[PDB]
Design a protein around this ligand. Structure first.
Ligand SMILES: O=c1[nH]cnc2c([C@@H]3N[C@H](CO)[C@@H](O)[C@H]3O)c[nH]c12
Ligand SMILES: O=c1[nH]cnc2c([C@@H]3N[C@H](CO)[C@@H](O)[C@H]3O)c[nH]c12
Ligand SMILES: O=c1[nH]cnc2c([C@@H]3N[C@H](CO)[C@@H](O)[C@H]3O)c[nH]c12
Lengths: 286, 286, 286
């Protein structure tokens, strides 16, 4: 196997961009669920469709979406992906994570990723948001790691570490940032596990994941994080718990995608603003 | 990655069939181990080789077999696969599970799958049959899920649920159906875990699988079930425990395929008739 | 999927070799870490680069290395791979394990493999060497098993067993061989788990692996062992624990590849000689 992209394809995509917009972003954001809004919270908004951008993964089947939106979020220069790629759609991971490498070349130095995810910790509840303190990359154990293949020294090392992937500073700020707006639910913290999907977990599987010590489960994110870290970026992210994963044979409920888009609307602005004020914590460039 | 088959390839395979046999099956059965017999228990039997059928995965290396057999089993219209495809043979999962999609288009609305499997629960013994109440789809965690790729809305949703994959009704009937023939061994019930093979588990691996809460382990089935569910079918199945998986370093025994084909002959008719009377439980069409 | 090599490609590579060197090895050794030295400990040393050898996986990117070195180690006819292939580099497993099949055709009947690996057992310490008593083949669970595809009856069975992969005799000799040179650290024994890499584990992942009962973790070896066993070879191996895998969020240390090459030099000769005297235990040919 081999990454389809050549070092220089990344550079070409970046420069293109570096010259079709005045913006120079510092924070990349990958939503999410609605986030929805954040496109409005932005200001100075300049949109591109993925389809216009050299090399950008070709999202394949319409529906899709596919806008890079650059602008300013709470006094930070931002670029946000509305719609992402997933392994379950058929993309090899070096396509799923291509944007991340573009972002680093645009000058970006922090990455914020968010997602919807099923709650595995029985303590959680629908609507909680969970801060990501660590992950379990199950696909990665078997081979599906977006770094598989020859390493490009210009991006990072052959064997990078992930033990510190979720910036401790940013996690503190966020827990602080959240109490100083006081809320009826606390900010949650824990381990995200990625599985590949696209079908949802059985009860026994859900039990496996709890045993492994996962608190939440979803189908993305982890690869983008690994590539972000390989690159140098500072990374921080979290999960809107959109559903309690099932957990015993009694219950007559199942997990669906109605509930995920629905819930994504309950917290539509809860997060819209969370992320937005979070911006003020993220350091600045020298 | 991409499914090699186009929506219309399925339709073409079905129609072909829908016109080379008078039968219209309602129950698909995928054996199994011998089952062997069931070809005889059938009546009105019309055979096809896979090799004659448009698009049917090309089983590759002779030995193989490869007969679709249509007919009547205990007053149900049935179609049965004698010999199946496996991931360990090299087939992508969208080939392994192609027949299942054909069956749905033939009008079939229930699927019965069976297999041989190693016992992980120490309580089980060689010869038991285990009813499948749930699965752990380890390949699926990493990417090897037969639904990976663009979803075809005409078959099912993008994110289907598997928490209820093994029809509770059918499981009751079967446990009942079995006591009303009274036996010296009970019907067993539990979790099937799929691993990809083709080599057999080490002791440490066997220990991993017990810890995860699996009761039996084999190399198939799960994908066909996921595709069956994605499609609407009612699904029910089980495992002939052909061997006790090893479990500690003391023992001087290993797992082989002699014992699997051998044992498959001990229960040759035990199941031959089990499945056969089971037919009478499965509802009917309106 | 399909193995790229044809039965006869193996034969062609072997014969070539069987006629460009006088040596006829009995023991294949796959290092390792430095082992470094063993090239010197050899005598009668005849080197080939992989690049000169028909069919030998093309190591792709220079740096690489790539010497088969034949000769005599402590009165055994040996062939040793300096540098190996890994799944994380992009090679399909049927390339990673190609040499092993060549070795069997050269007449070789034992295989010794060694590697660097992170310690998961808290009892271990940097510098220990761990004897491999068993493995957990996580990639194998999902599909990445070097035997996937049509089986070639001339090498081995379709469904071979791995429960006895690590020769009990050889393990005894080694534990004995080691006490009769008395040391301040004991020889360690346990389970090696393979993960695919190339990035290092998170804390949560490390915790998963302990729970599964792994004592050490690395990114290779297991596939070569499975192919060795499929073939008939006697197999024995171990791990230089080059680093203690991290294990809790407190610690401010990470895993790197400095430490792995460094430590590989601490034990440079500790193992250089261990393997070397080990030679005297391995039986002989009739
Ligand atoms: O319970 C779950 N299991 C796995 N994934 C998801 C998700 C995320 N939501 C999306 C579809 O429900 C999908 O893209 C997935 O990443 C929400 N809940 C769950
Ligand atoms: O102990 C086991 N582990 C994994 N698979 C099997 C099987 C099933 N039997 C077949 C070969 O033994 C194979 O197709 C597999 O699906 C029986 N026992 C075991
Ligand atoms: O803690 C670890 N996790 C996974 N692999 C390794 C290794 C082995 N060392 C090499 C790179 O560090 C790599 O080829 C891997 O197989 C040493 N330590 C660890």
């Amino acid at each position: 196997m081999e990454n389809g992209y050549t070092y220089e394809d990344y550079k070409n995509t970046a420069e293109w961009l570096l010259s079709h917009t005045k913006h120079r972003p510092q924070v990349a954001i990958i939503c999410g669920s609605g986030l929805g809004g954040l496109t409005d919270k932005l200001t100075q908004a300049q949109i591109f469709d993925y389809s216009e951008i050299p090399n950008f993964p070709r999202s394949t089947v319409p529906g899709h979406a596919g806008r890079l939106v650059f602008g300013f979020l709470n006094g930070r220069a931002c670029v946000m992906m509305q719609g992402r790629f997933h392994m379950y759609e058929g993309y090899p991971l070096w396509k799923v994570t291509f944007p991340v490498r573009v972002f680093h070349l645009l000058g970006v130095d922090t990455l914020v990723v968010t997602n919807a995810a099923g709650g595995l910790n029985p303590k959680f509840e629908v609507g909680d948001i969970m801060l990501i303190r660590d992950h379990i990359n199950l696909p990665g154990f078997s081979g599906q790691n977006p770094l598989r293949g020859p390493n490009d020294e210009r991006f990072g090392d052959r064997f990078p570490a992930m033990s510190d992937a979720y910036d401790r500073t940013m996690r503190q700020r966020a827990l602080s940032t959240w109490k100083q707006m006081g809320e009826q639910r606390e900010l949650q913290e824990g381990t995200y596990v990625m599985v590949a999907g696209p079908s949802f977990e059985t009860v026994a599987e859900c039990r496996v994941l709890q045993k492994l010590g996962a608190d939440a489960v979803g189908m993305s994110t982890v690869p983008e994080v690994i590539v972000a870290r390989h690159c140098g970026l500072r990374v921080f992210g979290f999960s809107l718990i959109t559903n309690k994963v099932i957990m015993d044979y009694e219950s007559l409920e199942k997990a669906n995608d109605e509930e995920v888009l629905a819930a994504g609307k309950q917290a539509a602005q809860k997060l819209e603003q969370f992320v937005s004020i979070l911006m003020a914590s993220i350091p600045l460039p020298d």
